[PDB]
Symmetry: D4
Subunit: 127 residues, 8 copies
């Protein structure tokens, strides 16, 4: 009766980073995909050419449908945020990070076009 | 997926001609990314053979039996021998030796540890990287 | 423009003591060439499809363009007439041969560039 | 493939905002297995040459066919006029390493350079 | 004989590197030099930093504290804080990528602590 | 109170193979080095250029001191089936003789080291 | 008649970094260890827990004897620019100090070995 | 230091292992022990066997011959069969290699001949097998 399961596509918010396309996965060492810290976390892998992973709170996850959600996610996170935080959040990503974000989105949209089992077999990053 | 006999992470015994019934786990093809196919008229599942030197194959459902534990192996042998050629029966009942006996034993140890786990955890621990 | 095969082309290869095997023409990971002349008679570097991949320099005379599994029967009967060969493969080798066929038929359903990017075995 | 400006193995200079024009090679995505796509505007997948290789989907407008190092000065002066400094340290070394790899790759037939310089991922 | 040093291979410690928070670590052998401790008059131990992006270093014994759990971190910070700029920096709570990796390390160290030293060595020794 | 511990050098006997230079190690997956199958087993790594690993019974392990033990191990195993004895005393050849030799060279180099150092140098990665 | 050869231990200077313990090695892709750019360069590998590599000019290389040279290298490098001198003499800290220290430890162990043995142990795989 | 031995790291040799044909090899350091030669009264060298499935071994100097090219293989076989006092050993030695082993032997020769066309430093950097 949990909201997300292994293979589910999510957007994750990490402070200092834009909403990033992710996939819920098992921790390569701890072999769990969700845990309690009173507050639920899920283990995610960040999509793109330089993959990363983290334990992200459910409050910082939104179900991924496509790229078109990103604008609303920014404007909603800006309205919920400190005067300096809002001006920082609405600012568009550039350079290396813009390319990697774009690469992530391309991988996530390709993953979305697949059945959960097939995308787990293709897009689960090996560690 | 909820409609097939087996799913990714399920533990099965696989029979390959010339080999004993082997402890396996149903898994995604590392290249083709499918775990089952029709060869439609006959279903196959992609399995990984447990042990210190892992292998993988597409095995017909007719050659798969749900894994419960080591105690099933004797019945599987005696049933396969009764279903089998005069030379095939004498070969099937003969107990495994050397390198293959060790690797079979190692597989059994891995399968029994995998069986003591929830499907999600065993997929995350026992899925062999290729 | 004069070679019969190019990198990414799907072929059947015959190695003495083995059945006609589903392969793909590839570059040598060290020598970086896909074809050479042994001496008068052309060879191509191929990768044998399956769960346990291998590679070799095979003579053009031992290569046939891969269309699908349906060719295997004729390849056997033709090799037998030119010569054990007619006897069907079993055990581990039958499984690996089957796995190769499955990989080759998936590779055949793809554009040459995509199949090179997906099925070129890393060494 | 015979209809696009670039193909797998072609050497190009790539411009990424905040980075100098970089010696690259057109290649297939190691995951998606495509080398070009449309986003109305064509992109090509490239690998950045060097001792620490990277890769990206770059628009055709930000790619220039690589001939040699001698082009870099003009590319900078043209990119400055269209747009408010010479590279140093770690980045200067890695850029230099890319030039060395790209110029070696340019001295080879497309098939051989694909077999030698395609970065494994 | 190893039974004479304060720490041994597999022991869980907190390590302090200037500009970084007290980090959950395990004492391990150098993957190249194959030693876990050395003298520089002053003893050092080779450690691995726990997390999703593992690192390693030769850290002085003076900068190591035996790991019991996360609850020690607050005292370690307040004691390290007690240079004017260094104190204001030390007491400040970690954010972004580093906070996530620190959290991942703690999760790994607390799992490792729930194990016998032989098992934790076999599970948590990072390959190099 | 166990006879062997992680890093200990042993000779292992597997039916159809000569007594082989090994090291007691933790299973890369199960993370245990010993188990009870009433009869104790230890997880070992076979030394050589093509390393292998297995769960071997304590009855089939002998503490490794050096190569000089091999002759006695053969003659004792032979004394312990008529065909099995003639096979056991026969000296190894080809690929297997080379790999056995490579194992002994690695084991003797491992023996010249403190247990911690040999664990850090000779534990095969899986 | 080249000053350096594969396996030789040197100090390399890269702008914005302290003199770093290296070892001359062949380029893992281009298979050359030296080239001319007029001015000779050597391919070096930077010692440490996070190894790197580069083509460094001979003018920015000094034969490595030991850590004791570092102080003189700094004071000699300390640069017509007033800001450059104050930044060069300043001691390294944090992550970089640890990795520099790890490099020195590796270079001094490499120095205690014959060239062939150190090439077989310390050549970083790529 | 290493200027007095017959072979050095990077040198191309043919190696004879009982039950196998004379094989194209390169003298290399042991990936673990980091030595390329040792005494067992009799000198051995660490070699890597060329081919698509590389192997390595410590081979006695008596079983090594400096590699010049493929053309030497016939004489090496003829010399080996003449030195082999056993009647069965001679008939086995002169027999030509087949199947998988013939292909891998061929692949080794192709690699060794490429390696021979290079300076010792370059061939060490290109053909030293990673372990
Ligand atoms: O290709 C990629 C994918 O992953 C990235 C993560 C990051 C990245 O730094 N983060 C923050 C992290 C938290 C835990 C570890 S990483 C994520 C964006 C939120 C930066 C660039 C990346 N590039
Ligand atoms: O560690 C292990 C696990 O896998 C093995 C498979 C085999 C083994 O050969 N097989 C047959 C195969 C089918 C196709 C590829 S392999 C399986 C027993 C039925 C032998 C030894 C093994 N040792
Ligand atoms: O999955 C696979 C793919 O490759 C194989 C090759 C072989 C196999 O042994 N060969 C012969 C070879 C010649 C050169 C190297 S290998 C090829 C079939 C003709 C056996 C099993 C395999 N299984
Ligand atoms: O050796 C190398 C090669 O690649 C590099 C890329 C970069 C580098 O950061 N970039 C920007 C990127 C966009 C997408 C991913 S990386 C490229 C120069 C434009 C920096 C240093 C490198 N060093
Ligand atoms: O997942 C992880 C684990 O290791 C890290 C180390 C560091 C990190 O940078 N350090 C400093 C180092 C000294 C020697 C090499 S690295 C350690 C915290 C003190 C940063 C992020 C990490 N993330
Ligand atoms: O370099 C090496 C080291 O390991 C080997 C094991 C074997 C080898 O086959 N065995 C039997 C095995 C039991 C379990 C898995 S392997 C061991 C000798 C007893 C053969 C050759 C080897 N070569
Ligand atoms: O463990 C290590 C070893 O290598 C490093 C290089 C560097 C490092 O960044 N450099 C500069 C480089 C030039 C070419 C590529 S890298 C070298 C010190 C001069 C930083 C940290 C390192 N840590
Ligand atoms: O591609 C290759 C290269 O190496 C091989 C070695 C062997 C091979 O088995 N040997 C014997 C060995 C002794 C020590 C380890 S291996 C060598 C030929 C004499 C067989 C096939 C090979 N294929």
């Amino acid at each position: 009766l949990l909201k997300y399961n292994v293979g589910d596509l999510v957007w994750s918010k990490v402070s200092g980073y834009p909403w990033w396309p992710c996939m819920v996965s098992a921790d390569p060492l701890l072999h769990s995909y969700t845990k309690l810290k009173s507050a639920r976390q899920y283990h995610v892998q960040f999509f793109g050419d330089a993959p990363e992973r983290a334990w992200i709170f459910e409050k910082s996850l939104v179900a991924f449908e496509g790229e078109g959600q990103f604008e609303k996610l920014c404007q909603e996170s800006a309205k919920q945020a400190t005067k300096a935080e809002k001006i920082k959040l609405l600012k568009p990503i550039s350079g290396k990070l813009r390319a990697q974000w774009e690469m992530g989105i391309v991988q996530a949209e390709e993953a979305a076009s697949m059945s959960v089992e097939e995308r787990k077999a293709k897009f689960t990053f090996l560690y």
